[PDB]
A paper describes a structure:
DNA methyltransferases [name]- and DNMT3B-mediated DNA methylation critically regulate epigenomic and transcriptomic patterning during development. The hotspot [name] mutations at the site of Arg822 (R882) promote polymerization, leading to aberrant DNA methylation that may contribute to the pathogenesis of acute myeloid leukemia ([name]). Here, we report the crystal structures of the [name] methyltransferase domain, revealing a molecular basis for its oligomerization behavior distinct to DNMT3B, and the enhanced intermolecular contacts caused by the [name] or R882C mutation.
Despite numerous efforts, we were unable to obtain crystals of DNMT3AR882H or DNMT3AR882C with sufficient quality for structure determination, due to their strong polymerization behavior and low solubility in solution. In light of the fact that introducing a secondary DNMT3B-converting mutation, [name] [name], partially reduces the polymerization of DNMT3AR882H/C, we set out to prepare [name]/[name]- and R882C/[name]-mutated [name] MTase domains for crystallization, which led to successful structure determination of DNMT3AR882H/[name] at 2.48 Å resolution and DNMT3AR882C/[name] at 3.2 Å resolution. As with WT [name], the central subunits are well defined, each containing a largely intact TRD and SAH-binding pocket, whereas the corresponding regions are disrupted in the two external subunits. First, unlike R882 in WT [name] which is conformationally flexible with poor electron density, residues H882 in DNMT3AR882H/[name] and C882 in DNMT3AR882C/[name] are associated with well-defined electron density, suggesting reduced sidechain flexibility. Furthermore, unlike residue R882 in WT [name] that makes no appreciable inter-molecular contacts at the RD interface, both H882 and C882 engage in notable intermolecular interactions in their respective complexes.
Residue numbers in the entry:
A (entry chain E): 629 to 667, 680 to 709, 727 to 781, 791 to 805, 893 to 912
B (entry chain B): 626 to 832, 845 to 912
C (entry chain A): 626 to 832, 847 to 912
D (entry chain F): 628 to 666, 680 to 709, 726 to 780, 792 to 807, 893 to 912
The structure:
């Protein structure tokens, strides 16, 4: 019931973008685990090696971020999301973000919006899906993720 | 470890095809509470609609099914599915893989399965089955096994039928890898599947330059009824809706082998009501 | 007026189609000694050869059967036939008539019948049946009746089935004009012939779109037409035939209950199971 | 097996009195000549009015002729008359027939007529018949032609 430092799971293409944005906002970090798709802050290698058991042991996680500024990188992210989400009945704050380029298949955008149950924020240009306050939508990339992540200051401890 | 009357089974069937799951469950004597099927091909929907007398509740495209739908229509005891394989098969040179094309339909399964399983603390029996081809990329198979947290069982219908048909089966059904029982009911040879006045060249048939049957003086391919027997279906199972022989052969070519599904489903008799 | 054991019936079927005659004879319990069929359509031959387990002896084009063949293959007790009608039907404006085109095929029947008739002094029972359409020219009907020395009986399958099909039957079968029995097997309504989840617009089909399904208009399915003409379901589900080929085979066929009505008095002449 | 008797003729020929003139040219006695067209020497009108019973009553017949110097109607009416007038099995009495048509006919028509009559035609016009001399192997108005064709009839029937 009190503000604690954030714990992060990153499938982002830039393994350190999330940590830099978080420290840029002054948010304390108790955990930051980075992974990549290829083909305690910690690098864990291929996402193909991260099992659900690893997600359990390293967790709990408060933030899950992924994407890159083809669709294989989304579903992997999706998997991690599913494995890191709080179970039903747990109301603790949990947030996620997924970025991709606007130049994508219209089918890809529709599929991602369906799977995430959310419509994207367009920023001229990139697409950003998330459940942060302000990313609710109808129907480098560092400072923009900073502004999008700003509401995390009202949920986790700041230094 | 508690006592209760065994209840009929509730099934969610994605990519249902010609309703092999319901046919097999009925043949095992398992009572079916409800059977919700997701399918888009109108020929397959007509087959399942006719041959099972409107028991199936069709819900259309698997991508039109939300988690809210799974909760409101559920609970489900059995979630089964065999997604399209044209973008997974190494035979296709234009295959887009598991993550693109029609391959990503697999994730819909992965999606709805997760929406359908019981919440933590619910010890109710819950079973699932996902089927696909053996001849896919090693990376595709590895990734499917990663997402399902299960390693597949390889079963070939040739052991229990007259068809060469090796498939991967992921799932938590009891005793999936157990040996298959060969009974008298199974037609192990192609000759047993042919119509009167036809001779089989080989023992088993493969799904060129081969017409598998001789009729009098000429060569010939299999008839629709003969493939129905080859795949284990009742004769004339696909004889609906004026569809061409090519349409029926296509429907049967994508389907599950009935005795294989029967082998996989049989242990469900110890969990649900039986007629 | 003499005594003898009833023997199985010997049949010559010209223009046999999908072997309706053998089906009807079996359904009546009449034992069939031999069934020789003349037919040229490979789809029809396949239907008859599969559905009757090689009992039929196919002899090909009716024009390749000589009188010596009738003697050597015979004797026959029953000679049946329904010759093609495309050149007799007034619906066809290119019709060549009874004496030209495929109309003259009738005379082949007329020929073989006369080759199969018992000789003078032979009182053995001998029956024959020739069938064709009602919608032919008056002169063609008069000439068929003159060559066969018989006047036709008009029977419409609509009395014992869900199909409008009025046909002329020449022959000497006992009591061909007697009233038809509407039994319990008879599906008099098109609705009784449809598959699950389809609704019939009309009581009897005349072959627009005769059925509704899920608020969508549709033509008859193959099994539904099989029921409409009185055949067993899936009787024509052989040989990878297109749906159009099945509809063609069924559209040329005899109505099964009508042939059953016509053949039934044969039970008092031949061995029955 | 008896002495020669005058000939009895059934004519469906196009040309009502051709056969009688040819028979008189050969000096053959005629006891009966029944003439008909498709449209004791009697004309009887339309062949549609001629029945098996009329054939039996006016008969017996020794010679049946038909044709013309579509072909289907003419030939099939002739074939009906030939069948009705033919001697029954066991009757070995002399019986002959002839059918003429123009050579300008459908090939299928020629094949069908040869099949029905069980004979191959004499080309000259086409002439089918069973007279001695009209026996032919498989292929690959003016009345003296019928005169020579009918010549063998004076060895089977009485001559004036
Ligand atoms: N988007 C979609 N939603 C639901 N079903 C789909 C679909 N896309 C394809 N399908 C169906 O998925 C099926 C995969 S083949 C599986 C057939 C089934 N196992 C049987 O035994 O009959 C095909 O029939 C195809 O029509
Ligand atoms: N020259 C020929 N010799 C034998 N059969 C022929 C023929 N020409 C056409 N036929 C056949 O004669 C049939 C006439 S329709 C009669 C069908 C049959 N009464 C039934 O109930 O099924 C057609 O099937 C056609 O294939």
């Amino acid at each position: 019931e009190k503000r604690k430092p954030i714990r992060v799971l990153s499938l982002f293409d830039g393994i350190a973008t999330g940590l830099l944005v978080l420290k840029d906002l002054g948010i304390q970090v108790d955990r930051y685990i980075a992974s990549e798709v290829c083909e305690k802050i910690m690098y864990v290698g291929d996402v193909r090696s991260v099992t659900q058991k690893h997600i359990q042991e390293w967790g709990p996680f408060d933030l899950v971020i992924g994407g890159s500024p083809t669709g294989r990188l989304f579903f992997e992210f999706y998997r991690l999301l599913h494995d890191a989400r709080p179970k039903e009945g747990d109301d603790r704050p949990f947030f996620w973000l997924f970025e991709n380029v606007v130049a994508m298949g219209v089918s890809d955008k529709r599929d991602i919006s369906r799977f995430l149950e959310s419509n994207p924020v367009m920023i001229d240009a990139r697409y950003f899906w998330g459940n942060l306050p302000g990313m609710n939508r109808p129907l480098w990339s560092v400072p923009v993720i900073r502004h999008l992540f700003a509401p995390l200051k009202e949920y986790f401890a700041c230094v």
